[PDB]
Amino acid sequence: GDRVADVIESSIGDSVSRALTRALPAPTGQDTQVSSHRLDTGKVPALQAA
Amino acid sequence: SDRVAQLTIGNSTITTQEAANIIVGYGEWPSYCSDSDATAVDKPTRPDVSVNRFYTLDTKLWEKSSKGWYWKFPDVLTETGVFGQNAQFHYLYRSGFCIHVQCNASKFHQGALLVAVLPEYVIGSVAGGTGTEDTHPPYKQTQPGADGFELQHPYVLDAGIPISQLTVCPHQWINLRTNNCATIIVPYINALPFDSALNHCNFGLLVVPISPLDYDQGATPVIPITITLAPMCSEFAGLRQAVTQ
C-alpha cells in the first residue's frame, strides 16, 4: 500500500480541472449604474497593464 | 377663470387676458427621459432655469393677403441664448415646448388663425410645377431659422397634405373676435430618446390664417403675430466643441 509520505500526500490522480472562472447567465447587456465625480489618490482604475 | 391665464417658467412670465385654455400635445406633459428609455451612458446635463424660459424670437405682420408661416423646432432656438449654446455644445437633445402665439386686435377686426404643431413636418418642393423635376428644398427653406418661412401653397402646406385635416394635430384657433393668444404644450415627439438638435427638427409649428383678416379703412392696419416659446424639461448629452450648423 501507501506508506511513504511523498505517495500518501501526492496529488497524482486528481482529475478535477481547477477552473478559475465559472459561467454566469447574461440574458441582456450589462446595466450602467450612476457615477459621480471621483477625486482620490492611490486608487486608479484608468491605468491598467495590457 | 379660463380666459385669463399666466404662464411662468424660468425667469420669464407671460400673461394673457383673452386666453382660450391650454392644449397639452397628445395629452402628455413634458418629462425627463426615464432610465429604462435612455440609451446614452453619459450623465446628461439639465441646466433647468437657464434654458427653460420664454423666448420671444420674431414678429410677423398679418395682412389681408397673407398665406401663412411655419417655424421649425428646435431650429428656432439653435442660435438663441444659453439654450442655443447648449444645443451647439451637446450632441444629444431632449425637451418639450410651450408655444404661445400672440396676435392681438380690436373688437372691430376679424380673422382666424390656425396654430398647429405638426411633428416631422417635412417640406417638399413644387417639383418644377409639372412634377418631372426631382428638386429638393434649399437649406434656407428646410431650416428657416428664427425668421420662419412663408408658405407658398398653404392648401397643401407645401408638402402635399391638405390643411383641412391639420386639426388632427395639437392645435388652437386665434379668432380675433374672442381670443388673442394660442397656447400649445408639446412633449418630446420622436422615435428616439435623444436626437441631434441641429440635424433633426422634431416638429414644425404652422400659423396659417384660414379666414382672411379684414377691417374698415381707418383702423390699425398693422396686426403683428409674435411667437413666444419656452422649452420644458430640456436635457443635453454628448458634449464636445461647439458646432454652428
* CA count, 13 A, side-chain hemisphere, B76: 25
In a domain, B116, yes or no: yes
The rounded distance, in Å, linking the Cα atoms of B127 and B134 is 6
What is the phi/psi pair of residue B43, to 5°? -75, 120
Q: In this structure, are strands B223-239 and B149-150 parallel, antiparallel, or unpaired? A: unpaired
Task: Write out the E strands in chain B.
Answer: 5-9, 12-16, 22-24, 55-62, 69-73, 90-102, 110-119, 149-150, 171-175, 181-186, 195-196, 203-214, 223-239
How many domains is chain B partitioned into structurally? 1
Contact (CB, 8 A) for B147 and B67: no
In a domain, B157, yes or no: yes
The rounded distance, in Å, linking the Cα atoms of B217 and B239 is 56
Name the method of structure determination: cryo-EM
The rounded distance, in Å, linking the Cα atoms of B99 and B32 is 19
In a domain, B207, yes or no: yes
B41 close contact with A: CB closer than 8 A: yes
In a domain, B130, yes or no: yes
In a domain, B135, yes or no: yes
The rounded distance, in Å, linking the Cα atoms of B54 and B43 is 26
The rounded distance, in Å, linking the Cα atoms of B4 and B19 is 6
Residues 6+ apart with CB under 8 A from B225: B59, B60, B61, B62, B69, B101, B102, B103, B113, B207
Closest chain B residue by Cα to residue A36: B43
Q: Which residue has the cell 422634431?
A: B202
In a domain, B245, yes or no: no
Which amino acid is it at B236?
F
* Cell output for B177: 373676435
Mutate to test the interface with B, among A28, A30, A32, A37 (most CBs of B within 10 A): A32
> Tell me, what DSSP letter sits at residue A31?
P
> Tell me, what DSSP letter sits at residue B139?
H
Contact (CB, 8 A) for B170 and B26: yes
CATH number for the domain spanning B231: value is 2.60.120.20
Considering only residues 18 to 37 of chain A, which have any Cβ-Cβ distance to chain B shorter than 8 Å? 32, 34-35
> Tell me, what DSSP letter sits at residue A8?
H
Q: How far is CA B138 from CA A24, B60, B70, B124, B226, in A?
A: 55, 22, 15, 10, 25
Under an 8 A CB cutoff, do A32 and B43 touch?
no
Question: For this experimental structure, what is the resolution in angstroms?
Answer: 3.3
Q: CA of A37 to nearest chain B CA: how many angstroms apart? A: 11
Mutate to test the interface with A, among B34, B36, B43 (most CBs of A within 10 A): B43
Count of A–B CB contacts within 8 Å? Answer: 3
DSSP secondary structure, B160-202, as one string: T--GGGGGGSSEEEEETTT-SEEEEEE---SSSS-EETTT---
Structural domain range at position B67: 5-239
The rounded distance, in Å, linking the Cα atoms of B95 and B110 is 35
In a domain, B167, yes or no: yes
Residues 6+ apart with CB under 8 A from A16: none
In a domain, B244, yes or no: no
